[PDB]
Amino acid sequence: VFHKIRNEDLIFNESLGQGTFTKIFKGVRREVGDYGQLHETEVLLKVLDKAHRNYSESFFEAASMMSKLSHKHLVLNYGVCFCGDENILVQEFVKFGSLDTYLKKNKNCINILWKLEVAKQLAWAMHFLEENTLIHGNVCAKNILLIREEDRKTGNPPFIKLSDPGISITVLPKDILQERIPWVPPECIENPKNLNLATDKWSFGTTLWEICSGGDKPLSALDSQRKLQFYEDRHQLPAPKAAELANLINNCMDYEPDHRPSFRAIIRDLNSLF
Numbered sequence: 001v002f003h004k005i006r007n008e009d010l011i012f013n014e015s016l017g018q019g020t021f022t023k024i025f026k027g028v029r030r031e032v033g034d035y036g037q038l039h040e041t042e043v044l045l046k047v048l049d050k051a052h053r054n055y056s057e058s059f060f061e062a063a064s065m066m067s068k069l070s071h072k073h074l075v076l077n078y079g080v081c082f083c084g085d086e087n088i089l090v091q092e093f094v095k096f097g098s099l100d101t102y103l104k105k106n107k108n109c110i111n112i113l114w115k116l117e118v119a120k121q122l123a124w125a126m127h128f129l130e131e132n133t134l135i136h137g138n139v140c141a142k143n144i145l146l147i148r149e150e151d152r153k154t155g156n157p158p159f160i161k162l163s164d165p166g167i168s169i170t171v172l173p174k175d176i177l178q179e180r181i182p183w184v185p186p187e188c189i190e191n192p193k194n195l196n197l198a199t200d201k202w203s204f205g206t207t208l209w210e211i212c213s214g215g216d217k218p219l220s221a222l223d224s225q226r227k228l229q230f231y232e233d234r235h236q237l238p239a240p241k242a243a244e245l246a247n248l249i250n251n252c253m254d255y256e257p258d259h260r261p262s263f264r265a266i267i268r269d270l271n272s273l274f
């Protein structure tokens with residue numbers, strides 16, 4: 001499925017931290033491009049240990065399945081290196097990084113119309129996935145990548161992409177799912193087999209809360225035990241600072257999975273906010 005990239009064409013330059021059972025690097029890929037031109041392309045490299053075989057199989061099946069659905073708001077995966085003791089996803093490098101970090105670094109000096117445009121773009125990406133009956137399963141602001149900043153002179157909005165799904169919550173340890181409250185929905189805390197398209201509607205609500213809160217993490221003051229009580233008592237998140245999206249957040253974060261609205265309906269709701 002994935003184009004094989006040879007270790008000899010990959011240069012690792014900078015460590016960018018960790019994901020869930022991944023190590024992330026900035027690097028360069030040497031390749032033959034359009035018209036035969038030789039390029040040194042900036043890439044994002046995600047390294048999984050082959051020994052974690054269940055995790056690696058989950059991670060790469062998810063990246064493969066989404067890359068079969070080419071879309072302007074979905075990250076470009078170039079290929080994989082079965083680099084011996086490690087399996088490496090080679091991805092496009094996105095200039096401005098993850099959205100939660102971007103919002104923090106700009107001190108939430110971001111107007112509501114910018115947030116609405118990013119929300120709409122994410123909703124259109126999710127509508128495409130819903131129409132394709134593909135579950136992402138880890139929608140969050142860390143997995144929103146900022147390709148382009150707003151340009152006030154041209155009127156161009158920011159432009160985002162949704163990153164790869166990562167290891168499925170159906171195979172992750174339960175302690176990890178609990179830490180991931182309130183992105184993982186209540187039905188998946190009850191049973192990870194309840195993963196469904198409805199899951200992404202809940203997580204989309206949590207992601208909107210992140211966007212409206214300038215990149216704060218909801219329930220960050222709560223440990224895992226208190227995160228369970230949060231769901232037990234069936235609380236909702238507080239209205240974010242930018243409260244314009246509070247109703248849509250609450251409508252998406254519906255404890256009844258079957259009541260969560262379609263992404264088509266979400267897009268219409270976003271459009272109605274003037």
Ligand SMILES: c1nc2c(NC3CCCCC3)nc(Nc3ccc(N4CCOCC4)cc3)nc2[nH]1
Binds near residue numbers: 016091145
């Ligand atoms: C697919 N996935 C990607 C990224 N994911 C992030 C990698 C770092 C940890 C959070 C997720 N970053 C990407 N690029 C970055 C660009 C600038 C970055 N810096 C912004 C300014 O502040 C320091 C980090 C970080 C990552 N590209 C990418 N393609």
